Amino acid sequence: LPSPDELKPFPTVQQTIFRGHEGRVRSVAIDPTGVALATGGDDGTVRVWELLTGRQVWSVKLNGDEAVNTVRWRPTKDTFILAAAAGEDIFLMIPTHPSVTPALDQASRDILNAGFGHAEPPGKWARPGTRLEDEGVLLRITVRSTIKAISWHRRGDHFATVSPSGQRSSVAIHTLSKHLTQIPFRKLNGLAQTASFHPLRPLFFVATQRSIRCYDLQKLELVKIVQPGAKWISSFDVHPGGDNLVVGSYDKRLLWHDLDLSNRPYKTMRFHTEAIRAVRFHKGGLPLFADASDDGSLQIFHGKVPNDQLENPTIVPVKMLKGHKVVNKLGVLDIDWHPREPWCVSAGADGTARLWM
Amino acid sequence: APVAQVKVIFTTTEPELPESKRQLLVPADIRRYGLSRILNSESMLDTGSIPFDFLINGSFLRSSLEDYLTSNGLSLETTLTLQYVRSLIPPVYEASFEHDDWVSAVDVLSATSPAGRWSSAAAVQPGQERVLSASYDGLLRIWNASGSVIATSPSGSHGGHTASIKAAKFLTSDRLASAGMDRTVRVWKYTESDHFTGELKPTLELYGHTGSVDWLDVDGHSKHILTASADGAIGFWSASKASAPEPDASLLPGAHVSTAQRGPLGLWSIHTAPATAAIFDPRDRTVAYSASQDHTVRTLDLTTGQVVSTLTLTHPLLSLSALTRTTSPLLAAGTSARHITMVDPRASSATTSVMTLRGHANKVVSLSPSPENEYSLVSGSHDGTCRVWDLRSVRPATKEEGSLGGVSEPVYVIERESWASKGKKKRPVAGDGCKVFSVVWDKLGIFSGGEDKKVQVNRG
Ligand SMILES: [Mg+2]
Numbered sequence: 001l002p003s004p005d006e007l008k009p010f011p012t013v014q015q016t017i018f019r020g021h022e023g024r025v026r027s028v029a030i031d032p033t034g035v036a037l038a039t040g041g042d043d044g045t046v047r048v049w050e051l052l053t054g055r056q057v058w059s060v061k062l063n064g065d066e067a068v069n070t071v072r073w074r075p076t077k078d079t080f081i082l083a084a085a086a087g088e089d090i091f092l093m094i095p096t097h098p099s100v101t102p103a104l105d106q107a108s109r110d111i112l113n114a115g116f117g118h119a120e121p122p123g124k125w126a127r128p129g130t131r132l133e134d135e136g137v138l139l140r141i142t143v144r145s146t147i148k149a150i151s152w153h154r155r156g157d158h159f160a161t162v163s164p165s166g167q168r169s170s171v172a173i174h175t176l177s178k179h180l181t182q183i184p185f186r187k188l189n190g191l192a193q194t195a196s197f198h199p200l201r202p203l204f205f206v207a208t209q210r211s212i213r214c215y216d217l218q219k220l221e222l223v224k225i226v227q228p229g230a231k232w233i234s235s236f237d238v239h240p241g242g243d244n245l246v247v248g249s250y251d252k253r254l255l256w257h258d259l260d261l262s263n264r265p266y267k268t269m270r271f272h273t274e275a276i277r278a279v280r281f282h283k284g285g286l287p288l289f290a291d292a293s294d295d296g297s298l299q300i301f302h303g304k305v306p307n308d309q310l311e312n313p314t315i316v317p318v319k320m321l322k323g324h325k326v327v328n329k330l331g332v333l334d335i336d337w338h339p340r341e342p343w344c345v346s347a348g349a350d351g352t353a354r355l356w357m
Numbered sequence: 358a359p360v361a362q363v364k365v366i367f368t369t370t371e372p373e374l375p376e377s378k379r380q381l382l383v384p385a386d387i388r389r390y391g392l393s394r395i396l397n398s399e400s401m402l403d404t405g406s407i408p409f410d411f412l413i414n415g416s417f418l419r420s421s422l423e424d425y426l427t428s429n430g431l432s433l434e435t436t437l438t439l440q441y442v443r444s445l446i447p448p449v450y451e452a453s454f455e456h457d458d459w460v461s462a463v464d465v466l467s468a469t470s471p472a473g474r475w476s477s478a479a480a481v482q483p484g485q486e487r488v489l490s491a492s493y494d495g496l497l498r499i500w501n502a503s504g505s506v507i508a509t510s511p512s513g514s515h516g517g518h519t520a521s522i523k524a525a526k527f528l529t530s531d532r533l534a535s536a537g538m539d540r541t542v543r544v545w546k547y548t549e550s551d552h553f554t555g556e557l558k559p560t561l562e563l564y565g566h567t568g569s570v571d572w573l574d575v576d577g578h579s580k581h582i583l584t585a586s587a588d589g590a591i592g593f594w595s596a597s598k599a600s601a602p603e604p605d606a607s608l609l610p611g612a613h614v615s616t617a618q619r620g621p622l623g624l625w626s627i628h629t630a631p632a633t634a635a636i637f638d639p640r641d642r643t644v645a646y647s648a649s650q651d652h653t654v655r656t657l658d659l660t661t662g663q664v665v666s667t668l669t670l671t672h673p674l675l676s677l678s679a680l681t682r683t684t685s686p687l688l689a690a691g692t693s694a695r696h697i698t699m700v701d702p703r704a705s706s707a708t709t710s711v712m713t714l715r716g717h718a719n720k721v722v723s724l725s726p727s728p729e730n731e732y733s734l735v736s737g738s739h740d741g742t743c744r745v746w747d748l749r750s751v752r753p754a755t756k757e758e759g760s761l762g763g764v765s766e767p768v769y770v771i772e773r774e775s776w777a778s779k780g781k782k783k784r785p786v787a788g789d790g791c792k793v794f795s796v797v798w799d800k801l802g803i804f805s806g807g808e809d810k811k812v813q814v815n816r817g
Pocket of ligand 1: 243
């Protein structure tokens with residue numbers, strides 16, 4: 001009901017461009033401290049950047065033949081560990097960065113080494129080789145099929161990977177402190193697209209093409225099935241309070257789910273002429289979320305979760321961000337918010353990452 | 358015939374006028390042109406051709422006097438108090454210093470520059486001033502008048518910086534200070550055999566910060582250094598090995614936890630976000646001001662190492678600068694929200710009477726005050742431009758801030774000559790190839806370095 005003018009602050013302008021990648025930038029991720037950006041793309045390189053200036057401070061080529069599909073930081077500030085998926089491997093590395101003191105390096109290495117010696121398998125843990133080791137890449141985890149999604153648990157000892165063509169092994173939970181990889185959900189039936197942990201509870205969301213399955217992690221049992229009513233789900237994100245979802249789809253529908261009231265969508269939002277590639281909630285208290293589409297644009301929304309005063313979520317579109325160039329019918333592929341500020345970064349098929357504020 | 362006239366009262370800040378001749382009858386249709394030759398008359402000040410501008414209640418006079426009267430609620434027999442000022446001699450492009458990488462920092466060693474004055478009170482210079490340039494390649498460079506490199510800092514392999522340099526300033530003609538992504542602050546000694554040959558040798562390696570050291574202020578009299586770092590801490594340092602404590606050995610490049618290695622006199626983690634600025638108070642060296650992305654300006658008592666005051670603005674702060682008015686302390690704070698905020702450190706929060714400098718289209722990451730006009734200063738932004746401000750120019754705020762405080766607009770815009778050279782009338786988006794990282798205003802000129810790998814010189 002309110003107008004965008006009353007709903008400040010939200011990003012309106014392009015302010016920093018990250019250049020260096022060749023081919024599509026498939027993923028973007030800002031470090032836990034909001035100081036650095038991480039990117040991965042077609043050229044199979046992972047690149048870490050000085051966020052506001054847009055300076056590349058570190059990079060590594062993990063695999064010559066495989067593009068980096070996704071990059072996700074470990075959400076802990078006591079370490080500086082970055083995860084990257086290329087092909088069927090997961091790489092855990094410590095980017096060379098001014099924040100990495102001798103102390104922080106050691107703390108990070110200890111976290112990566114702890115699992116060692118804990119008494120076609122789901123996961124293969126090993127050193128990645130001297131070349132990658134020299135650049136700070138310390139672990140390679142090999143799963144059965146190509147990885148399209150990485151999702152950390154907030155405490156940073158668990159992370160999930162999703163391989164849409166892995167069939168029975170499409171969804172894996174990895175435990176860092178044990179170097180353990182499990183396939184805990186065996187009749188999931190449908191093509192797993194992505195997954196996420198829960199911000200406050202021991203729950204786990206798995207998105208298939210048409211629905212999102214919610215699991216009890218303690219019992220490994222299905223609790224409920226969220227029904228977005230989309231023909232192909234591309235992405236979803238959980239609100240920090242754990243009771244709300246935004247869902248993106250190739251059908252071009254953006255969906256808000258009020259989990260407390262029903263398993264069907266509360267609102268359906270169509271602001272794109274092409275498929276939606278990614279959705280992301282701001283995780284630091286600002287009532288904002290955004291979607292990314294192949295039409296080259298990002299739509300920023302005002303989204304307030306229900307409370308005392310609010311019987312329903314207040315959803316108001318505030319700004320559409322344009323600037324990414326569409327290449328081969330691909331536009332914006334990934335989004336991430338700053339931990340505290342109303343700033344978002346976008347992954348572009350045009351070979352760039354762009355900072356908006 | 359008696360043309361319609363306006364009564365005016367001339368007043369000024371700049372030495373002035375005899376009170377006998379300050380009130381005057383003047384043609385209502387007159388303009389800035391006519392009013393300044395009246396000021397340049399035999400009668401008034403007998404200055405032949407000094408160009409003047411005129412401020413009326415905080416606004417410059419771009420049209421005739423009557424137009425101002427009708428624009429407002431004045432009645433053409435209202436007495437206008439026009440305060441006249443020197444017209445800004447436009448700082449046009451003059452030269453560029455080419456680098457192979459991004460220029461992160463800029464500073465000038467001149468007779469009037471702070472380091473030059475400290476030097477006189479070790480050597481001093483006549484017509485041979487030096488320009489210091491830090492680069493993301495990790496090397497400092499010293500330039501002279503004709504834009505040629507006199508000296509260059511040694512690489513990391515030889516005791517130099519082992520990462521990109523973020524900030525660097527002249528302490529004196531004798532000593533430099535620099536900081537960067539290697540979490541160190543390095544004190545240098547500059548020697549010049551002859552005026553086209555120089556040398557930089559590391560005096561101290563200073564350890565302390567847990568992240569990139571991005572901001573640097575120095576005092577050449579006491580040999581002290583202020584630093585703001587991404588770790589959210591403000592560092593207070595001595596540039597002499599004698600008064601500098603021993604380092605935290607865990608922060609040393611040796612640990613797996615030649616040049617003397619030392620620590621800070623004070624390192625205070627007073628911010629919940631990257632510390633973007635830290636400067637000495639112009640009036641009192643015992644006092645320091647810090648600015649950070651946590652939206653706060655904090656005042657530091659250096660002798661006790663305590664936060665005696667905290668000011669909380671609306672937006673993240675990326676740059677800070679101190680002004681003389683010593684009638685009061687006055688700071689300029691560059692914001693990530695593309696504007697500047699003028700503040701008095703002890704306010705606790707911004708009153709309705711707060712001044713804002715608008716015009717920039719990107720992050721303002723650098724600031725420098727005018728050497729000759731106390732009321733003026735220059736800003737450096739990621740939009741690729743440098744904007745000159747006159748704090749005497751001020752109007753009420755519009756619906757932009759919903760009529761909160763007052764707003765000043767630039768009196769000049771220094772464009773990036775690298776971009777302007779192409780003749781294109783379409784600007785880089787997001788400061789694509791032209792971001793400005795550092796600007797310094799000296800009487801020798803306005804020097805600005807940035808992403809375009811150039812130190813750009815502007816002067817009248
Ligand atoms: Mg609940």
